[PDB]
Write a protein that binds this ligand. Sequence first.
Ligand SMILES: *[C@@H]1O[C@H](CO)[C@@H](O)[C@H](O)[C@H]1NC(C)=O
Ligand SMILES: *[C@@H]1O[C@H](CO)[C@@H](O)[C@H](O)[C@H]1NC(C)=O
Ligand SMILES: *[C@@H]1O[C@H](CO)[C@@H](O)[C@H](O)[C@H]1NC(C)=O
Lengths: 594, 594, 594
Amino acid sequence: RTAVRAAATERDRFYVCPPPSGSTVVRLEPEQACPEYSQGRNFTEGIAVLFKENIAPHKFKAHIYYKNVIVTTVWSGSTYAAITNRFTDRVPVPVQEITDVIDRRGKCVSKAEYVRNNHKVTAFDRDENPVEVDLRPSRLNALGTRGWHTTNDTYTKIGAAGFYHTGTSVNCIVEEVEARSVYPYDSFALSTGDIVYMSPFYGLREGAHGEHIGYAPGRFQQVEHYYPIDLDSRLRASESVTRNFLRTPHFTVAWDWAPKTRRVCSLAKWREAEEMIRDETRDGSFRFTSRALGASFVSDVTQLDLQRVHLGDCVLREASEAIDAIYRRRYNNTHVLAGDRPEVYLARGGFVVAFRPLISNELAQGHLRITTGSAEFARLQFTYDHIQAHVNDMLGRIATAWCELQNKDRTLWSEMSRLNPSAVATAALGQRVSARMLGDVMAISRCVEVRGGVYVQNSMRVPGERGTCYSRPLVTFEHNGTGVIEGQLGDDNELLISRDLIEPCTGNHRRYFKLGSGYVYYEDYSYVRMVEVPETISTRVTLNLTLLEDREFLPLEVYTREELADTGLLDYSEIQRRNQLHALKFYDIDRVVK
Amino acid sequence: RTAVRAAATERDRFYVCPPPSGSTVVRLEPEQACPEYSQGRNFTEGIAVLFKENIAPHKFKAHIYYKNVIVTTVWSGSTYAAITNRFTDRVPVPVQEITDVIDRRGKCVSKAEYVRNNHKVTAFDRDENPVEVDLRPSRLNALGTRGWHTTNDTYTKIGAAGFYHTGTSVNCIVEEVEARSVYPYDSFALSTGDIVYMSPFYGLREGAHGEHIGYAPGRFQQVEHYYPIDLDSRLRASESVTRNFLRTPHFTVAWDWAPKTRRVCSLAKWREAEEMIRDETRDGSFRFTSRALGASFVSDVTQLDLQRVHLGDCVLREASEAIDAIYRRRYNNTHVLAGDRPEVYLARGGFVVAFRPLISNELAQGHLRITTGSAEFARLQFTYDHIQAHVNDMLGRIATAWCELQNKDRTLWSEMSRLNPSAVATAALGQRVSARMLGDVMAISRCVEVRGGVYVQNSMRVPGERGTCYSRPLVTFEHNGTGVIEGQLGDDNELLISRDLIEPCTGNHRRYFKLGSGYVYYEDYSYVRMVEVPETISTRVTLNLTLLEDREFLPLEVYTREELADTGLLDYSEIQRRNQLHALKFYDIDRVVK
Amino acid sequence: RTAVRAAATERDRFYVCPPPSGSTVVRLEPEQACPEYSQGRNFTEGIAVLFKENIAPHKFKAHIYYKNVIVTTVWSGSTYAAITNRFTDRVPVPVQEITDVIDRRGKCVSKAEYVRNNHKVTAFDRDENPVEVDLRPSRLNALGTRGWHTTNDTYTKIGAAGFYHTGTSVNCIVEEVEARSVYPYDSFALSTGDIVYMSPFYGLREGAHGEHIGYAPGRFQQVEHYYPIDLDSRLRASESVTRNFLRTPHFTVAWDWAPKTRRVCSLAKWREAEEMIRDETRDGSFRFTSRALGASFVSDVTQLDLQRVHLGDCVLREASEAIDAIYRRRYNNTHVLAGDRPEVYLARGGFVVAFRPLISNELAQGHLRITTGSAEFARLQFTYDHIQAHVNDMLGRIATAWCELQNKDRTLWSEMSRLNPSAVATAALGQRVSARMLGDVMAISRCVEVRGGVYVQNSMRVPGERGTCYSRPLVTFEHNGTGVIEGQLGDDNELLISRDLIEPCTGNHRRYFKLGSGYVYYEDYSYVRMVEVPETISTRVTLNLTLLEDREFLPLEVYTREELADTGLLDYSEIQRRNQLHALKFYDIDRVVK
Ligand SMILES: *[C@@H]1O[C@H](CO)[C@@H](O)[C@H](O)[C@H]1NC(C)=O
Ligand SMILES: *[C@@H]1O[C@H](CO)[C@@H](O)[C@H](O)[C@H]1NC(C)=O
Ligand SMILES: *[C@@H]1O[C@H](CO)[C@@H](O)[C@H](O)[C@H]1NC(C)=O
């Protein structure tokens, strides 16, 4: 009939629970309203053709006609000859001579009649009389680089010693040439290095005449219904052309006249987006997403008027073509196109989007200069948006289910609140409380810590009654004023003010009761030992979520600025640097003879 | 009083539950410690100005002064004239003549006095006496490309037949020219194609004299307090300059002298980051994140000393300007700048970050050559980090709530463990067990499978007692040694060793008892049929999480390397290729006359 | 003994629950099968070397040998001299003279003997007799740009007035030159601006002879066992070479012959991936992921045969080198390489991947033209894949735990279904139902709304019995036909058909009963007031998931197309534009003398 002193730790403290009066009354919180997230997105399927700023020059075929005049002064000596001069000059071939000699016969006159220093001057091949010479192809002739000439020889004079002799070579040259024009196209340059200070689209028939010409009107001429001739097979072409001719002091250049608007565009077809999705979730903007491309393009809801664009005719033409070609190939039997024409938008970063919506059979029943850079932002827009939408959708789904689960699981908590309102209110409040059901509502009283040392009684027998025992052990403790309380060991370290927990005594009685950090072992209503229960059972579900690791994105380049500038056979600046030093490098230019 | 043989499937097996002794005792696992993830990040708001490596040349205005000497040899014939020679040469205009004739009067002398082949030589326009000729503007004169000349004519000699005549043209030319200097700036080049082998910042006053000059000291001269004159309105400028003059063998070039450090910088302003956030979560590094830019820049915690940078003066100057301008515009009333100066860092990929922290009013109370490439890594750093931080934060939040929920829900499991310790321990252990509460701890015994065929008894009446019935059906089975057991059908296919489940008989008795894969139907304490219960009730919450789909990022380029190299009017290498073939193409250079 | 009219709102409606017959019987839905997501990925560790398309020209050292012939015509006057002509021409130095005079003595003959206009011509320095002159270095000589010449003077004739005098300068020049060849390498260009129309790898020994030569066979020559000499220290090199010589009309160029396959490759080493992971999860493809690089490269499972590549010899050579070097440095003691050679693949976007798997010590016991652009797609592939895999893994983990948790928590629901089948079935069905356990299955009946006004009875005393009271209040209501029902207030607004809920009366009786939107207060079995219970207790766990915000990725470029084209000292096209205007700008070319 002795006593064992109980031991309490912080976490495993003893508690007294004063009876709850109706002073504080609580209800179990009703089911919450669940978060409803964006279920369904607003969009349009279609076909798109993306256009970029045209950066390429206007390229066209042309012919250069000139006579290569070389004048050589030789000083004939005793046992040698020395070139004292070799003066070279390209001279134009008149239009008359092109059409009437060169096209007509494939011959060229052995003389030149041109203006130099404002004086009318002449040059005769071999210092001889004019003869129409045949134009023979060069040995080096190749596709797009054919040339014809009249001589393989450069005339030089063979004379008497102690004299200066002058010979004159005249080689008539016709060359297939490639021309290039860079915006605004007020000039062009030929494969020969010659720049023509005139518009390639300059003509005399209306529209064309309001194009630049840096040359006097007499230097230019057009020849309508001109049927070109091959200077090898001397055959004419089946279709005629308006042939432009410009006579400069060093050559005559010819090219086929064509109207600017047909030949040139300020924009260029970049890519086709066969499965283009136009998103309409964000307001006042469209977002053109392409799975194929891995790119999103943001534009306004309002269309681009292509009349604002200088030379934007190619857009609608090339866009309708590819869209119509795609439709035929991919949607002909499943869908129908919308609105008898494609829609055109100005997307972020200088991209022009020509989009045409796809309608399923079932649902059918101020001047602008567009500058384009990279499409790097658009792929990033794509990547980000694809992930953001997914994780947003999925967390939405978790949030709702978390709410829904807790709402359902309230049935379990209400049911427990009828039976054990205290353990429910302790879980809810997160602090040790005593509770009583006052019908359909709980009365709450807080539980207070027992600081004065607690002692367990060795026997569990009712003193004065055989056959009746106490179900849980007896304790002695200090709470409030009364220094000693004849109490009982309740549940989860609650000490009971009274001793009313009873049971008829049973044979082979084994009990483990929680007492502080551990357990007290009782055998046949008598204290035995202070045991430990190290074995546990868990109804928990493991959720191991690991973190998304740090990643370092270091600068990465396939080719550098240096590598990209070093691809050429020659570098103008590098050559000039070295070349312009030649006089200072191999001569004393600073010395002066007295 | 017959029997029906029960049918067990794998999943719906019969079990016998031996009584649990205190041999194995368990506790319900206490509430766990919950994961606490990084709640709050360390950062600094501010304003930044990003600087990139200067790739642009130093551009400045200049003037070229030369006399264009053309000497023509004409051979007058019977009925013609032929140019046998036309020798062209640019000659310098002496400084004396620039200041005393050209600036003073707007005139130029009709002769040239220069050195060629180390000999002092002269050239007279029209082979006549020296006259100061007025400089008239060219017809083609435009903004930044003005030129003045003295003649429109090229003098040629008109003489007697059978003779060689020589005429001399001298055109004095002054041209507005644009100059460019590329690092290290020891030379410059003019719009005319001429390279000047000297520093644009070379002077004679201290500092400037230790700059390259590839020319003899006599060829150079500075003119202090020089007031320039317009050669059209012959008005002088209000402010004077130090005027540099360099006389080369072919021209005199003049330019305004300026000190290198003022005019040139090795870095260039790239972008302003108005809302720059400097992250301080990772140690030994700063991360400059810009929402505006969509870029993160990683640098050291230690500042960049701009004294390590060759020509880094522009940085602090231009950074303070833009930061101060931004502050005035965006933060003037809400915040205050910090530390009387902006901080400077060397970020990853060659970016210089000039950052100045923003302090809210409430909180206020070895030589370096910087190489820059792309900012592609920085946008990727940004994207990745923005997503990683969000998903890490959100999963952290799920992890904690999962722990917290299970911790709360332990109140429900403990409560059940008092009432039904077996069903709790079976859920926990994940295997069929029998359990008994030994006070505050459970005794566990495992349940064993009944392999010997089971039979249900047709009646549920107590033999020998009217008015008392068995609550659940009677069974017969084989377990351990004893071949026949007079048992009862327990819960969820548990077969009971005994027959102690009793109830006073009731009128209109209908029962469905689980027996193997299905149910046994009993009516008024008598077997009827083997029914199926196909209807279910579920308290589950659906969570449909779908996977983030695979995405293919295919190579994408707006303009190729080819497209970017093809934008020019001429290509030096292409022209040279064709041009240097001309002799081989239109002549036989290999033939020799015997 | 009066009555108070109850008030019902939508959400807090009154219900009558008809008794359930076995008409509808339900079971609680058994535990579900849980989703099992991809646990474990298939991959190979190794080392990789990435190769890109070679964009760089073939660069090699060379020497240019020529004699700079200048012929000057001076007209001596009264008090002056005028240059009437200055004709410049570069002439070749014969191979004989290079080896026998220039290499042998470091001297060059003061005359030139060359062919011009098909005529054999001579040039004498100072119009004097041939002398072997020493080659002296230029003042400007620098590393890689050395030059040697024979004179600093340009010979001019000083004569009698009224006469034309002609002088001849011959300067023999040898220059260290840099050569460049661009694919297909059928020509090369020198630092001087000269293009050599021949292959740098053309030779006469087998293999080399099937390479382009645009020159007659006599113009070329190889010199085997040639030991070069420094023209400063007149020392010979220790190792000999096969020396190529090509005599063009303007110079002799020499270079060391080397075989094409050794000197040139169509691919170039880009980066080393020390920790390259080759993923094998997607079928019919490999994915080469590099943490270091932040890039993923997609290729076929089938290797690249490098015999399909024109000049692909560098790949295997350079790949084995770096891989073997890396292994030695990082894996020598932990792993072993696999398969006696590296594997080679053709990745997406023109990248060649040379991968060699790493085997841990423990586990050991048609013609192709490759075009490369950017690696932008590969970093995006990397970023996306890294995130996708993580979030997919983590949601998988949530999905399984959600299933597992609900499966466990079924133990709680079954247990409640025995005690309160109605509250379980109401939670499950999401509608108010009455339920009865018919053994191991529930009988369900739906609950109907009470529309006819309800009234609570002021007393809770059993009329006719003292000491016995009703536990819950009495009500009067209208349901079905019977206009008045002597009922009782049940749980959660259920009205009971009968009045069988009883309790022995207790002293100090306080009760709150739910009645519609609120509560009814009862004191000592008598009505008092209609109270409100505003205080709640919650067992809910907060889960605050916020959305991933929209981000705008705006176009961002470090340097523009314009900025990148403006880095050069000169621009060929810009210079030519201005230069070719000179005649039109400073002269009247259109005027003609009559
Ligand atoms: C040049 O010479 C070749 C023969 O070597 C000949 O075929 C060709 O027709 C000649 N061309 C001219 C224009 O004389
Ligand atoms: C050139 O001629 C035009 C008239 O055609 C005239 O206006 C201009 O002043 C002249 N220039 C010179 C330098 O003679
Ligand atoms: C050129 O002159 C310098 C002296 O000014 C001298 O050192 C050099 O050797 C000379 N070169 C030749 C080739 O005469």
